[PDB]
């Protein structure tokens, strides 16, 4: 029925005007008086030299000391950042890993990729070796992202256009989030873990309610695939990095884009995105091989993290905010401070 | 300055490093092949002669081949094709009989052009398999090749038609100086396909070694 299609367009226009009336003053205008952060000079405090292939994902532990990194050499490595020591080296059944996660409790890590399976590994067993706890199957596309809610819950992003919430002990999809029209590439849990935002290849970001499993909001503005997404520390906003060489900040309550982080001389895609503990700095990885530090409130480039010889694929900030970890398509993780 | 437990942790990290080095050395001497095809172009038969990604491991003349098939991996291809940058070679399967319809040969040509000129496969040689020799041979005498290639100007025989198809596929590649295309007609079913793959892989490995030594 073409009438239903017409009604959808009319509703789409209605919501566009609804959030248009709420756009009285831009963020730039509001933050035009605060002093700039100046220059952010971050030095490579540590280099991790264990992986032998491209690093595709890394995640910080909640203790801000142990981080897990995923590389296509078929290994998950848990690093002790302070001493650079390798705590664990987990061989993966499938070497085509694309995502990594670290349970907030620290007892588990998650892995996934082109195998369409999210593997849960038990890091604390009486046998002294890391063991595969569960293998979550049900996605028809590669595993894009995964994030633990707790020791028994995990939300996974998949290239089959859907996101899912799993019950690890049973290994079943408790909830399925099906709103997107393209591959879902990124995933970010809110601080309270009551919801989460996903970015997909349809150039849109969607806000989901984990309890009810329903797209609460949809955000547009990007011109290409969204590869990275990361909620604000406050939890009332999130930032997205896409293939159009642009990062933008969306606010849930305002329900529209707030700021755009782009430069004329940047023409490559964004691979990762993260915020500072205060949310004042937006750190984004690029295909330029160097990460970029943006003043999240003024949209001014505050610094550059140029320490990688290949594409920066992953990027994370410790919970205490002390340091930033960057992984790239070379086999090295770098810690900055 | 390190504590006793710190020293023990460092020793454990050292052992992990040694194991990682051993695993990397083991993996560096293995041949990685990426299997591609437009559709039912003969991938299944070539896999027979030897979820998402399917890995097939086989040993030939003391050389271990891991061949990855991504036919079941239905999704944006540009979002995970770069995962295979650095594979030893690409095995492209084309149904030589899929020229009448339905156009199918044109889709195979489009996929071959996309893969060969991909930014991630500039230096990756491709092994071209032209399957279904017999069926194409029978069909050529009945359905002329002009259906697929109107510009074709030659006798409607198996040899000339196959040569023309191979020439078109080989000319579909732009960077002829940084990569090679090895073409085979795979219907013998006499262990010749695996021998051809082995020969092409050894040639590619020798070329890569020459490049590393700066000779190329």
């Amino acid at each position, epitope marked *: 029925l073409d009438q239903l299609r017409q009604e959808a367009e009319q509703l789409k226009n209605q919501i566009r005007d609804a959030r248009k009336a709420c756009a009285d003053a831009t963020l730039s205008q509001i933050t035009n008086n605060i002093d700039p952060v100046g220059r952010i000079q971050m030095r490579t405090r540590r280099t991790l030299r264990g992986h032998l292939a491209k690093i595709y994902a890394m995640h910080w532990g909640t203790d801000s000391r142990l981080l897990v990194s995923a590389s296509q050499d078929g290994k998950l490595i848990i690093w002790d950042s302070y001493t650079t020591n390798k705590v664990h080296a987990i061989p993966l059944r499938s070497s085509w890993v694309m995502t990594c996660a670290y349970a907030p409790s620290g007892n588990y890590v998650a892995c996934g990729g082109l195998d369409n399976i999210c593997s849960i590994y038990n890091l604390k067993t009486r046998e002294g070796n890391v063991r595969v706890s569960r293998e979550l199957a049900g996605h028809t596309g590669y595993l894009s992202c995964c994030r633990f809610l707790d020791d028994n819950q995990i939300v996974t992003s998949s290239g089959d256009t859907t996101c899912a919430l799993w019950d690890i002990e049973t290994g079943q999809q408790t909830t399925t989030f099906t709103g997107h029209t393209g591959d879902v590439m990124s995933l970010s849990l809110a601080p309270d873990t009551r919801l989460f935002v996903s970015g997909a290849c349809d150039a849109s970001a969607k806000l989901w309610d984990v309890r009810e499993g329903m797209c609460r909001q949809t955000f547009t503005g990007h011109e290409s695939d969204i590869n990275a997404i990361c909620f604000f520390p406050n939890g009332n906003a999130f930032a997205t990095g896409s293939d159009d060489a642009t990062c933008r900040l969306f606010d849930l309550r305002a329900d529209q884009e707030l700021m755009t982080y782009s430069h004329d001389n940047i023409i490559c895609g964004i691979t990762s995105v993260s915020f500072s503990k205060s949310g004042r700095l937006l750190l984004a990885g690029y295909d330029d091989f160097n990460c970029n530090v943006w003043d999240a409130l003024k949209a001014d480039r505050a610094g550059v993290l140029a320490g990688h010889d290949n594409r920066v694929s992953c990027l994370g900030v410790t919970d205490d905010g002390m340091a930033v970890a960057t992984g790239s398509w070379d086999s090295f993780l770098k810690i900055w401070n | 300055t390190l504590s006793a437990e710190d020293k023990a942790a460092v*020793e454990r990290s050292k052992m992990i490093d040694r194991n990682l080095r051993e695993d990397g050395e083991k993996a560096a001497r293995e041949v990685k092949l990426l299997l591609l095809g437009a559709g039912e172009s003969g991938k299944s038969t070539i896999v027979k002669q030897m979820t998402g990604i399917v890995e097939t491991h086989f040993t030939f003349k003391d050389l271990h081949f891991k061949m990855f098939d991504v036919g079941g991996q239905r999704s944006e291809r540009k979002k995970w094709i770069h995962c295979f940058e650095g594979v030893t070679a690409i095995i492209f399967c084309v149904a030589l009989s899929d020229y009448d319809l339905v156009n199918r040969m044109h889709e195979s040509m489009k996929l071959f052009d996309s893969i060969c000129n991909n930014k991630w496969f500039t230096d990756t040689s491709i092994i071209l398999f032209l399957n279904k020799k017999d069926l194409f041979e029978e069909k050529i005498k009945k359905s002329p090749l002009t259906i697929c290639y109107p510009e074709y100007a030659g006798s409607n025989t198996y040899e000339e038609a196959a040569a023309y198809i191979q020439c078109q596929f080989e000319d579909l590649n732009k960077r002829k100086d940084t990569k090679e295309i090895y073409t085979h007609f795979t219907c013998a079913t006499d262990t010749k396909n695996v021998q051809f793959v082995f020969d092409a892989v050894t040639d590619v490995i020798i070329k890569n070694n020459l490049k590393d030594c700066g000779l190329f």
Partner: single-chain antibody
Amino acid sequence: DVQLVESGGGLVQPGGSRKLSCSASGFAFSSFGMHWVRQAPEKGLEWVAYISSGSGTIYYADTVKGRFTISRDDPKNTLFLQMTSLRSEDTAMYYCVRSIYYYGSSPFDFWGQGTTLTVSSSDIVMTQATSSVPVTPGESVSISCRSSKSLLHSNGNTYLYWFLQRPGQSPQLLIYRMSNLASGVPDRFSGSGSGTAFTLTISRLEAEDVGVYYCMQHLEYPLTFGAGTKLEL
């Protein structure tokens, strides 16, 4: 099922030789550093030797160096202690102890059942002043241990370990690094203190808690144990 079974103990004439074996089962033996701990017939624990994972590092107590040899057969999941020139002072029960060392790990977590050997006829000092103290179920008691040298390290760790040896049983790890509760230990046990002064507090003490409590330092080798505080009643 993480048992360690020791064998090879028995009567041996003075000056003889004897090899003790320890068959590991139910865990990744090659991933654990192994210790030999000794307990005279009516005295406290005494660390003997240590072999690291991969056999890279080996340590011996000054009273057995040159006489004892520690070795492990990782494929066979066995730990060996070759004793030569045995003296009357070597008569004791020998315990096979596994310990894994990484950030956040729990060394000395599992002890074997022990094998008895009877011979016919700079070190950090850990002090436990209270050799014994009566206790009643439901009450709270605190065990005191003291160190001659500060166990706090520049990395922030205080390398003190608490072990409980119930009557006729192998020692069991309670607290590692003075603050962390070992896996499977109830929340009643608590460890606190500063460098050179540590306390083990038991809240609502009940049955199964009577025994000898030992404090061990892991700051540097040789590992030294306290005299041991006994609970009864």
